[PDB]
Amino acid sequence: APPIMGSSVYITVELAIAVLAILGNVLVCWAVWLNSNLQNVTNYFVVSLAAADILVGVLAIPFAITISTGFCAACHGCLFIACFVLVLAQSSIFSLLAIAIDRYIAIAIPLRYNGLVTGTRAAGIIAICWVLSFAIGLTPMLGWNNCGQPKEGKAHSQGCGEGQVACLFEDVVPMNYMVYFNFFACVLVPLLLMLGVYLRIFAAARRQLADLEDNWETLNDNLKVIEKADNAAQVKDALTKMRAAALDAQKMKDFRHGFDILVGQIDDALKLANEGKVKEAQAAAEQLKTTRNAYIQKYLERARSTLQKEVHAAKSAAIIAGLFALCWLPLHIINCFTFFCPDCSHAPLWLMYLAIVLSHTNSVVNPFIYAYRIREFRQTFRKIIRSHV
Ligand SMILES: CC(C)CCC[C@@H](C)[C@H]1CC[C@H]2[C@@H]3CC=C4C[C@@H](O)CC[C@]4(C)[C@H]3CC[C@]12C
Ligand SMILES: CC(C)CCC[C@@H](C)[C@H]1CC[C@H]2[C@@H]3CC=C4C[C@@H](O)CC[C@]4(C)[C@H]3CC[C@]12C
Ligand SMILES: CC(C)CCC[C@@H](C)[C@H]1CC[C@H]2[C@@H]3CC=C4C[C@@H](O)CC[C@]4(C)[C@H]3CC[C@]12C
Ligand SMILES: CCn1c(=O)c2[nH]c(/C=C/c3ccc(OC)c(OC)c3)nc2n(CC)c1=O
Ligand SMILES: CCCCCCCC/C=C\CCCCCCCC(=O)OC[C@H](O)CO
Ligand SMILES: CCCCCCCC/C=C\CCCCCCCC(=O)O
Ligand SMILES: CCCCCCCC/C=C\CCCCCCCC(=O)O
Ligand code: NA
């Protein structure tokens, strides 16, 4: 069948994807720009990721359409339009890895996050990652390419000029680069590192939540021990365990006030215990319950609510990392079959184009994930569209 027919379908789908990638990710950038509640280090990497996806629509998809025609081109010019998308994919990987690491720092050492993770450092890291993305993605332009071995019969059949080749991705980009360097080293390894970071994030969240409820249980258990104690020494033992835990749990004004009352009331009871005044110590310790109800439970619940939101933000980020993998793995896997199985028939052209458009679909999906999973984005999206569009 005439190639322009299947080409028309491929090109039309690509153009549709390009429109959606531009519109959705422009909206992401506009939201971060407009809403100061969205201006944090995490979302600067989100913006860098949206910028890469905007350039997929503006440049990479037009380049992909061009290289599907096999037009006559100087080989290194053909190389650039083939490889530019690798720059954008690599930048996306760096942004996704940075987002994961940022969220791990926030959950594991929240006390030093704001001093460690600053806007100026994020902007410098983003700049560095874009430079490294060009070096990685344009590495074929430094000489790891097939321009030295042009397909002269294909060039002559298409009427190409001297020094020109039919511009086709797999004719100019070496497959060993795509499999060993681009896929294994530059894509697979960072994605696996991301998985490890997310596993540590969720394990850290689970441990901290367990410790909060466990510390609550230890506090309440020890009150019962004091109540049903029969000498002052048993009261002393339990209060000593309560006092060390209270100082451990203190590590905002009513928060500090609540713990000041709590530690003071424990010291009050411990002093009576050490005088052998059991009944007064048990009565003194009952006062702790008023402090527990008015203060400690509010701190516990707020700490629980903060940790659960951190789980929610890490899950949303992990979904976006997983969707990148889901959209890009088929094309990489196909390249692995082409490279490792020369006895296998090449994947058919229709499947090649399905795998290409699928990888381009990833530049559409993140704005939807933010809208459905992050209220602050969803509300900002609403105000921008309603008050303008
Ligand atoms: C800043 C942005 C908007 C500029 C975009 C520039 C792009 C479209 C330009 C820059 C380099 C250009 C390529 C440079 C060399 C060649 C080899 C020639 O035989 C065919 C055209 C081709 C393949 C060009 C296509 C267009 C190209 C990719
Ligand atoms: C969830 C995602 C990551 C899974 C992706 C699996 C896809 C990419 C796999 C599953 C089955 C695979 C195909 C199985 C058999 C062949 C025949 C061979 O002559 C060319 C490759 C080809 C056509 C494979 C291409 C890649 C393929 C389509
Ligand atoms: C964590 C996971 C997603 C890592 C990615 C899995 C990749 C590297 C695996 C999954 C399926 C694998 C392919 C399965 C079968 C064949 C056919 C064989 O004749 C050559 C190797 C080849 C082509 C494998 C190459 C590697 C491969 C593509
Ligand atoms: C992830 C990077 N990457 C690729 O690895 C890739 N590999 C191909 C090959 C396509 C093709 C193969 C055989 C053909 O005809 C026998 C053919 O005719 C038009 C096309 N395109 C790729 N693209 C998009 C530019 C990409 O972006
Ligand atoms: C705001 C965005 C600014 C604009 C962003 C850039 C626009 C992208 C358009 C096209 C890439 C395709 C260009 C490659 C076309 C090559 C066709 C060609 O040169 O064929 C001649 C002949 O084959 C040689 O001998
Ligand atoms: C602001 C948007 C920037 C992109 C504008 C261009 C939109 C995409 C247009 C078509 C891609 C180029 C197709 C050229 C195919 C060349 C085939 C040939 O010369 O034989
Ligand atoms: C594939 C090419 C790989 C290139 C490896 C060498 C480039 C690495 C360069 C340095 C990365 C960090 C740069 C630090 C910038 C300055 C820091 C600062 O001034 O505070
Ligand atoms: Na991307």
Q: Which amino acid is at 322?
A: G
119: its two tokens: 């806007």
- For domain 3-196+314-386, the CATH class is mainly alpha
- Which ligand 3 atom is at minimum distance from the Cα of 340? 20
Measured between its terminal Cα atoms, the distance across the chain in Å is: 43
- Please tell me the distance between residue 70's alpha carbon and the centre of ligand 5 in angstroms: 13
**Ligand nearest, relative to CA of residue 191:** 3
Experimental method: X-ray
125: its two tokens: 């890291």
Contact of 188 with 328, CB cutoff 8 Å: no
DSSP string, 66-111: HHHTT-EEEHHHHHHHHHHHHHHHHHHHHHHHHHHHHHHHHHH-TT
| Token pair 């030093």 in the structure block, residue | 112
Burial environment of residue 246 by CB neighbours within 10 A (0 to 12, 13 to 18, 19 or more): buried
| Token pair 């979302």 in the structure block, residue | 43
Q: Say yes or no: CB of residue 58 within 6 Å of ligand 6.
A: yes
Please provide the CATH number assigned to the domain covering 208-302: 1.20.120.10
Contact of 226 with 235, CB cutoff 8 Å: yes
Q: Tell the residue nearest (CA) to atom 4 of ligand 7.
A: 132
Strand partners, 166: 72
- Please tell me the distance between residue 347's alpha carbon and the centre of ligand 4 in angstroms: 11
- Please tell me the distance between residue 269's alpha carbon and the centre of ligand 5 in angstroms: 82
Residue ranges, CATH 1.20.1070.10, the chain: 3-196+314-386
Q: Tell the residue nearest (CA) to atom 2 of ligand 6.
A: 58
Q: Say yes or no: CB of residue 333 within 6 Å of ligand 2.
A: yes
Rounded Cα gap, residues 54 and 71, in angstroms: 25
Rounded Cα gap, residues 27 and 86, in angstroms: 24
- Please tell me the distance between residue 162's alpha carbon and the centre of ligand 4 in angstroms: 24
Q: Say yes or no: CB of residue 26 within 6 Å of ligand 6.
A: no
Q: Say yes or no: CB of residue 193 within 6 Å of ligand 3.
A: no
Contact of 43 with 32, CB cutoff 8 Å: yes
Phi and psi angles of residue 166, each rounded to the nearest 5 degrees, phi first? -65, 120
Rounded Cα gap, residues 291 and 38, in angstroms: 36
**How far is C-alpha 216 from the chain's CA centre?**
32
- Which ligand 2 atom is at minimum distance from the Cα of 326? 3
Largest distance between two CA atoms of the chain:
105
Phi and psi angles of residue 373, each rounded to the nearest 5 degrees, phi first? -115, -15
Rounded Cα gap, residues 94 and 67, in angstroms: 26
Rounded Cα gap, residues 73 and 341, in angstroms: 29
- Please tell me the distance between residue 63's alpha carbon and the centre of ligand 5 in angstroms: 8
- Please tell me the distance between residue 81's alpha carbon and the centre of ligand 6 in angstroms: 12
Rounded Cα gap, residues 255 and 253, in angstroms: 5
For residue 138, count other CB atoms closer than 10 A to its CB.
16
Look at residues 296, 260, 268, 271 and name the one whose alpha carbon lies nearest to residue 284.
268
- Which ligand 3 atom is at minimum distance from the Cα of 339? 23
Contact of 167 with 67, CB cutoff 8 Å: yes
Query: Given ligand 3 and candidates 182, 337, 345, 346, which is best to mutate, with the most ligand atoms within 8 Å of its CB?
Result: 337
Burial environment of residue 156 by CB neighbours within 10 A (0 to 12, 13 to 18, 19 or more): exposed
- Please tell me the distance between residue 56's alpha carbon and the centre of ligand 5 in angstroms: 15
- Which ligand 1 atom is at minimum distance from the Cα of 74? 19
- Which ligand 5 atom is at minimum distance from the Cα of 160? 25
Residue ranges, CATH 1.20.120.10, the chain: 208-302
Residue 166, helix vs strand vs coil? strand
Cβ < 5 A residues, ion ligand 8:
52-53, 92
- Which ligand 5 atom is at minimum distance from the Cα of 161? 25
Rounded Cα gap, residues 202 and 302, in angstroms: 19
Rounded Cα gap, residues 29 and 22, in angstroms: 11
